[PDB]
Design a protein around this nucleic acid. Sequence first.
RNA 1: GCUUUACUGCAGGCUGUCGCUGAGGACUCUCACUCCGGGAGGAGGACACCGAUAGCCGGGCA
RNA 2: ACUCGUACGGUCACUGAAUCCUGCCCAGUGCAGGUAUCUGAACACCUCGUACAAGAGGACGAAGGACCUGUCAACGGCGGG
RNA 3: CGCACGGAGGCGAAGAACCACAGAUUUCCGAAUGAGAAUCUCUAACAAUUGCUUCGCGCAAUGAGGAACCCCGAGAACUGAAACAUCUCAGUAUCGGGAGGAACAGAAAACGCAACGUGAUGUCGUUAGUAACCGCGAGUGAACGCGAUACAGCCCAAAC
Lengths: 119, 237, 46, 194
Amino acid sequence: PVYVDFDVPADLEDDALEALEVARDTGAVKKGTNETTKSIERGSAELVFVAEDVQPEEIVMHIPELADEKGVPFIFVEQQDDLGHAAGLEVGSAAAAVTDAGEADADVEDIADKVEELR
Amino acid sequence: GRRIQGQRRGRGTSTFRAPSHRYKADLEHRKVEDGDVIAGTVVDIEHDPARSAPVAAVEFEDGDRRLILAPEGVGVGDELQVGVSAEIAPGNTLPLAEIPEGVPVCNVESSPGDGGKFARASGVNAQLLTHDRNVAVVKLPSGEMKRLDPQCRATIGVVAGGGRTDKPFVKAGNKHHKMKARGTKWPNVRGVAMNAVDHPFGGGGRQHPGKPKSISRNAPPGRKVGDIASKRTGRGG
Amino acid sequence: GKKSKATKKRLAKLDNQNSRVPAWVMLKTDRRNHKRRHWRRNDTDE
Amino acid sequence: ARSAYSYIRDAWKNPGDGQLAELQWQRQQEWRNEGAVERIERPTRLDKARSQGYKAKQGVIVARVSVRKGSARKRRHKAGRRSKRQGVTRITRRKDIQRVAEERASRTFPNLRVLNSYSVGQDGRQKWHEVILIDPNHPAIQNDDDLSWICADDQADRVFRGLTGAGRRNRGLSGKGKGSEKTRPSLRSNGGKG
RNA sequence: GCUUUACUGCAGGCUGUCGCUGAGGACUCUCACUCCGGGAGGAGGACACCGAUAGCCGGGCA
RNA sequence: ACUCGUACGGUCACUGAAUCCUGCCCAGUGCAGGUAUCUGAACACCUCGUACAAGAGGACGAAGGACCUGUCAACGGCGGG
RNA sequence: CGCACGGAGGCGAAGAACCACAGAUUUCCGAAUGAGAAUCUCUAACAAUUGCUUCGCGCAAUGAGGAACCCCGAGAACUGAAACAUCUCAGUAUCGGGAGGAACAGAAAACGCAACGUGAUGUCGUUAGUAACCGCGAGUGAACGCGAUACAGCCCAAAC
Ligand SMILES: [Cl-]
Ligand SMILES: [Cl-]
Ligand SMILES: [Cl-]
Ligand SMILES: [K+]
Ligand SMILES: [Mg+2]
Ligand SMILES: [Mg+2]
Ligand SMILES: [Mg+2]
Ligand SMILES: [Mg+2]
Ligand SMILES: [Mg+2]
Ligand SMILES: [Mg+2]
Ligand SMILES: [Mg+2]
Ligand SMILES: [Mg+2]
Ligand SMILES: [Mg+2]
Ligand SMILES: [Mg+2]
Ligand SMILES: [Mg+2]
Ligand SMILES: [Mg+2]
Ligand SMILES: [Mg+2]
Ligand SMILES: [Mg+2]
Ligand SMILES: [Mg+2]
Ligand SMILES: [Mg+2]
Ligand SMILES: [Mg+2]
Ligand SMILES: [Mg+2]
Ligand code: NA
Ligand code: NA
Ligand code: NA
Ligand code: NA
Ligand code: NA
Ligand code: NA
Ligand code: NA
Ligand code: NA
Ligand code: NA
Ligand code: NA
Ligand code: NA
Ligand SMILES: [Sr+2]
Ligand SMILES: [Sr+2]
Ligand SMILES: [Sr+2]
Ligand SMILES: [Sr+2]
Ligand SMILES: [Sr+2]
Ligand SMILES: [Sr+2]
Ligand SMILES: [Sr+2]
Ligand SMILES: [Sr+2]
Ligand SMILES: [Sr+2]
Ligand SMILES: [Sr+2]
């Protein structure tokens, strides 16, 4: 919430999570806040996801601004467990990063563009 | 020396406590949501040990039996109303806003909903003077002009039992019976009559406070005795 | 006074202790209960 | 590259600036309405906890403890004393608030042992610290190569004997040379002059 | 043991200052914090409370 | 604690039923209020000093004091010539 | 067939007594734990606080004791100074909490015989009543080093 500056519609989030699912089966994805952070830093990330139910918020606070100064696009997910499931984990995930998409490049690119318009 | 009596009090031991286990009830106003549809019938008139004044037992519509801070003139069978739309009559409770100017009131709330704080003793009453949308000016029994929230609830009329103070106790034993009903150590031994160790005024051959009685507001407990921060003393001037 | 069951057991024991050293012990040790108590002269516990 | 943790760290270097300032302003409202010792599921300062020994494992517990702010709450002398031993107002205790917090936590969790602790802020009337405690009886810990040491008998009630890092710092054991003449190996053995 | 304008200090009270503490030498606001209210909500408000320190009073106490 | 209490209350003191009465003094001390001006600490601020710091000085000035006022059913006083 | 030198009776070659080791039994109160109680009572019990958790007291922990020693907190006064306030008595007495067979300390953001030198930590001897403190009064009082004792060095956090 202190790191969230815009509300992503439930429908956009659905598409984004589906995109993330096919991105791991096809291309490659990063699971976990640390791994996601290094991707934005190395520039290997194309789309980063950030849960909104992260307590404490410290864990994720830095993502939004770090992505901005790295051109890396980001989107919010209402729940941590959903993001984790979409990434293919039995557990939750505070943040995720689609490091080079796979057979979803068009969808990911549109999602990025849909977010830009949405502030 | 030794702690003076005023300090012994603070500890709240049996000697200084009020006979609470013997007390009846706190005469706070009823809590009504709204609509004023809360009226009741005076079922009995009782003596209140804590205030040496009569108090009234009321049986409300919704089945609630509660003791009420009774004004003068309230009797069994009479119907009492409590709420915004209450009728402007003696014994009725409603906010100051709904009360017309120049009307004697009692058991006035300090902050809306507290149940009543001002004008509760025998025979007294507050006087509702000025009205407004933001503040109700009430004259308290001490003569002080008090600004209150117009939403503060109050009971129309003066408190029952007026004139109590007009008859002298005549004898020590009468005072005695009254003090047994209060949180007070009685009788009273003069400071000047005690030893130097027991009070700032004790000691010395003949009895006399070996110092001026007008003590500073900043004086610590044990020293703050006599005439506390007096602006003046005596009857003249 | 009113005695409880426990108090009674204690009083009972005190009474039993308040006996003389058996005669045969005198012979065996070839020659006095140092704890002999009297109800009036002494005082028990509780 | 920088770890994600380094960001939590950097944010906590200036708790009165940035997003952290707003987080604290919000949180403290809730903390003030909480008890003396509240067990929390996750550390507020992940980097600090992990750095101090924390692990997302079974038998690792974190609790936030609040303590009143300021000096000693001392009772004035009944009997006679020389002016030197009469003071009451400016006298402070020898144990720091963090140490008081660690002990309150360990007492709440009698079966656990204090591993370490860190500050999570304060307001005008109190201070908050999060304590990391360990279950020395849980196998997930008895088998841990980095934590099984805390299972030893001599580690029992370690916090009450000043064996915590905060305990050791407060006892003046930081320096190995000059200044530690009366602190090492113990305050007591040096006649309590440390 | 007791007294006081004995010496020296200590509580305590008053008063300034710093922190809590925010937004637009005098002011407005609300969001912390405080109080009333069963609740909705109302009153107050960066003050007050509290921590720290400074000056004054200080046989109440040593 | 007072307090299931709210000035017709309760706290702190003095005198000590009724009756007839209760004069003069506010200089000192006490309490209280006011106060142009004077004095009045620390923080922040300014000058000097120190590549910094110690430190010296300055400006502003709260309560308090000076000063004025009220007050004896306040401590007490009501003489010599 | 206890101390215990009586009487009566009995046990032991089916090897008793006695001794060592191991085991059985082991009332009630007691941390005392189902609730309560001056050692008893009332109607199934890890009371209470915790961890794990199959979320069920299912698996576990804590509690209390112990001669002193030990560690962390609270901390006098008599006394000395020929009075006394800083100082001294003294971080002593005493109090609160806690561990062990020993505690504590411990592998340098050290030392600073200044070095081309030493090399975790205790402790003992010494350095030394030295340096330092102090109404510079009365008094308080180290360390580095050296000679010994014993010697032992390692594990995380993060990067990837
Ligand atoms: Cl009376
Ligand atoms: Cl512990
Ligand atoms: Cl060397
Ligand atoms: K002394
Ligand atoms: Mg009432
Ligand atoms: Mg009585
Ligand atoms: Mg009298
Ligand atoms: Mg006398
Ligand atoms: Mg006295
Ligand atoms: Mg007199
Ligand atoms: Mg017999
Ligand atoms: Mg309240
Ligand atoms: Mg004295
Ligand atoms: Mg008299
Ligand atoms: Mg008399
Ligand atoms: Mg029981
Ligand atoms: Mg002497
Ligand atoms: Mg000294
Ligand atoms: Mg030792
Ligand atoms: Mg001398
Ligand atoms: Mg010494
Ligand atoms: Mg040295
Ligand atoms: Na007897
Ligand atoms: Na514990
Ligand atoms: Na005497
Ligand atoms: Na005068
Ligand atoms: Na046995
Ligand atoms: Na148990
Ligand atoms: Na259970
Ligand atoms: Na002497
Ligand atoms: Na003397
Ligand atoms: Na000295
Ligand atoms: Na040498
Ligand atoms: Sr999870
Ligand atoms: Sr009330
Ligand atoms: Sr009420
Ligand atoms: Sr006197
Ligand atoms: Sr007069
Ligand atoms: Sr007798
Ligand atoms: Sr224990
Ligand atoms: Sr008279
Ligand atoms: Sr005067
Ligand atoms: Sr070695």
